[PDB]
Design a protein around this ligand. Structure first.
Ligand SMILES: Nc1ncnc2c1ncn2[C@@H]1O[C@H](COP(=O)(O)OP(=O)(O)OP(=O)(O)O)[C@@H](O)[C@H]1O
Ligand code: SF4
Ligand SMILES: [Zn+2]
Ligand SMILES: [Zn+2]
Lengths: 65, 311
């Protein structure tokens, strides 16, 4: 529901839940290869379900070099 | 699910046809690094290795893995003098070393030579990244030779290496690129144990390990061509798992050996390897000091004194 974006460079948006992570990433236009989504201490995969009460942190895997 | 234990996967890799839970991803990552090292003979068992550490996810993960693998891994951090980014990079790296009881060597660019990367982007005649790259490579090699390290390890990953290759093809050098570069006189060996790992995979390791790394990118990185290359390659990877690795492996094994003979000189100033009379590092500082004096940022009677290569 609440999605914290990286890098900070802080950015925070919000989306609807009860759908796979694959779906919410596509809405945000994020390439799954380039990010890691974290709920608490647990990493989420594309098939994993995000809730309507969930708080996610999406971290960029991409190094600017 | 996890391929090993059948429980819920923390990391799914479609490129490898492999999914793993936390415990078994951690083991696999360490073992794949060990396998990468053995295959290309990057390091000797228990050997002293200089790890170039930025505080970023890759180089901290590398320092972690090389320590776990029994190598004697000393970190080198270079404080590049880029604003708060460099300050935080140092702090994060010191914190990592402190917690794990690891030896960290530090070179402060501004403190040693008078000017950091931002000043170099004005005074050197080079753009920031150009001056920075040169400073990093030279100083890393210098510390290695001075402290008697045979080999240096950097945290370059698959996306990094694939991007460089793609860049080199888009703007034709090629033959110089490799995961293992041989030691020479005045030149430590250079190895990239993470070169087959995607950024996503290294980051997953770093997160699952609970490693505190600097999230912030350097401010000079935005709009870099490397980001464009990675974006294009990852566009392909998304719909064609394994493409990046086939791309880089294909080049290394097939194309590169058929691409290519002058001996490296010795710098008149510092004595370190160069193809010129005076190496690029020493020429940069001579130009910087000249320009600095004109702008009254440096005293006229101050002179650049290089640390000469020992023998
Ligand atoms: N300030 C620094 N001091 C020492 N080594 C560095 C420094 N910056 C980069 N390196 C070395 O060069 C490699 C490539 O750096 P690059 O700028 O591509 O990524 P990075 O910002 O260092 O993040 P990461 O540590 O995740 O690679 C790093 O993995 C590290 O080994
Ligand atoms: S981007 Fe990478 S290279 Fe360009 S300046 Fe910042 S750190 Fe040095
Ligand atoms: Zn498992
Ligand atoms: Zn020199």
């Amino acid at each position: 529901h609440r999605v914290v974006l990286r890098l900070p460079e802080r950015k925070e948006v919000e989306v609807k839940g009860n759908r796979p992570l694959r779906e919410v990433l596509e809405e945000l236009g994020l390439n799954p290869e380039t990010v890691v989504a974290v709920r608490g201490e647990e990493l989420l995969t594309l098939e994993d379900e995000v809730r309507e009460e969930d708080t996610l942190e999406v971290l960029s895997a991409i190094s600017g070099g | 699910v996890c391929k090993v234990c059948g429980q819920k996967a923390q990391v799914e890799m479609r490129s490898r046809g492999l999914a793993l839970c936390r415990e078994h991803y951690l083991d696999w990552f360490v073992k794949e690094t060990e396998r990468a090292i053995r295959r290309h003979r990057m390091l000797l068992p228990g050997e002293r290795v200089l790890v170039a550490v930025s505080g970023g996810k890759d180089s901290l993960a590398l320092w972690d893995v090389l320590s776990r693998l029994g190598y004697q891994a000393v970190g080198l951090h270079i404080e590049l003098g880029i604003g708060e980014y460099s300050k935080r990079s140092l702090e994060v790296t010191q914190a990592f070393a402190r917690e794990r009881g690891l030896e960290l060597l530090v070179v402060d660019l501004k403190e040693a030579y008078g000017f950091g990367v931002p000043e170099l982007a004005r005074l050197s005649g080079r753009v920031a990244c150009s001056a920075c790259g040169l400073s990093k490579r030279y100083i890393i090699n210098q510390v290695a030779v001075e402290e008697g390290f045979r080999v240096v390890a950097t945290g370059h990953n698959l996306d990094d290496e694939a991007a460089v290759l793609f860049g080199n093809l888009l703007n034709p050098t090629l033959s110089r690129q490799g995961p293992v570069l041989p030691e020479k006189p005045g030149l430590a060996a250079r190895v990239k144990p993470f070169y087959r790992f995607s950024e996503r995979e290294v980051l997953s390791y770093t997160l699952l390990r609970g490693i505190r790394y600097l999230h912030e990118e350097c401010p000079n990185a935005k709009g870099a061509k490397s980001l464009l290359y990675k974006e294009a390659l990852n566009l392909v990877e998304r719909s064609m798992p394994g493409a990046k690795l086939r791309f880089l492996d294909g080049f290394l094994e097939k194309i590169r050996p058929r691409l290519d003979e002058v001996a490296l000189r010795e710098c008149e100033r510092c004595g370190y390897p160069t193809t010129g009379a005076v190496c690029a590092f020493c020429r940069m500082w001579d130009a910087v000091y000249r320009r600095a004096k004109k702008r009254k940022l440096l005293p006229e009677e101050v002179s650049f004194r290089p640390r000469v290569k020992p023998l």
